[PDB]
Amino acid sequence: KETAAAKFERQHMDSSTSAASSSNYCNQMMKSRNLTKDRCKPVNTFVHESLADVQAVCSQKNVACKNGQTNCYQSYSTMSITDCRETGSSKYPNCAYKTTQANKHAIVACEGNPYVPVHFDASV
Ligand SMILES: [Cl-]
Ligand SMILES: [Cl-]
Ligand SMILES: [Cl-]
Secondary structure, X not given: OOOHHHHHHHHHEOOOOOOOOOOOHHHHHHHHOOOOOOOOOOXXXXXXXXXXXXXXXXXXXXXXXOOOOOOEEEOOOOEEEEEEEEOOOOEOOEOOEEEEEEXXXXXXXXXXXXXXXEEEEEEO
């Protein structure tokens, strides 16, 4: 199987780049991270910061989650983030995504020991 922490790293971490390069970034990242292996993930976010920086968010501003869980945290400073969403013309296995780059505060759900991100709630 895949631990929650490892899944978050695969699905949302991207420290190799400082920002989404071109409009084909999401089509490639969603593919290479295996987010389109069995089906097209409708929406997914990538953070362009070190793993340490993203994990550090677990000890920053503790905010409520969308579902109501009290284990979400918001990064004190804005981070380089890329939002990948399926376009109107996307059908498995031909998944197509729209790349929307921006700098927003990352909000992640943390759990376990070490207390690391296991879910990406939103970006604000
Ligand atoms: Cl794993
Ligand atoms: Cl995988
Ligand atoms: Cl996401």
